[PDB]
Amino acid sequence: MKVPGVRVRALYDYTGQEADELSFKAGEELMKISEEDEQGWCKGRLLTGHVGLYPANYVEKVGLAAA
Amino acid sequence: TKGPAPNPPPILKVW
Numbered sequence A: 001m002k003v004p005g006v007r008v009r010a011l012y013d014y015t016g017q018e019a020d021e022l023s024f025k026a027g028e029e030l031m032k033i034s035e036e037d038e039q040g041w042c043k044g045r046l047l048t049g050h051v052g053l054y055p056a057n058y059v060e061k062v063g064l065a066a067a
Numbered sequence B: 001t002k003g004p005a006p007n008p009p010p011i012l013k014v015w
Helices: none
Strands: A006-010 A029-036 A041-046 A051-055 A059-061
Touching: A029 A051
Parallel strands: none
Antiparallel strands: A006 A029, A006 A059, A029 A041, A041 A051
């Protein structure tokens, strides 16, 4: 266990930027699996096992309080 | 990066 899925929720309903990106719904939950890029792009997996890039700038965690 | 993202974000920031 080194990089578990990071649970995030989208603040709006968007569908990638090209055909290689993931599609999420407003309030849907996704699990990031890779790191963020210079364009705020993050690679992850949806709960359905779908893989691709998702706009990190359009989502936030839904884990615990900020502290 | 792979491709030029939808970025910058749309809203929910400045409050």
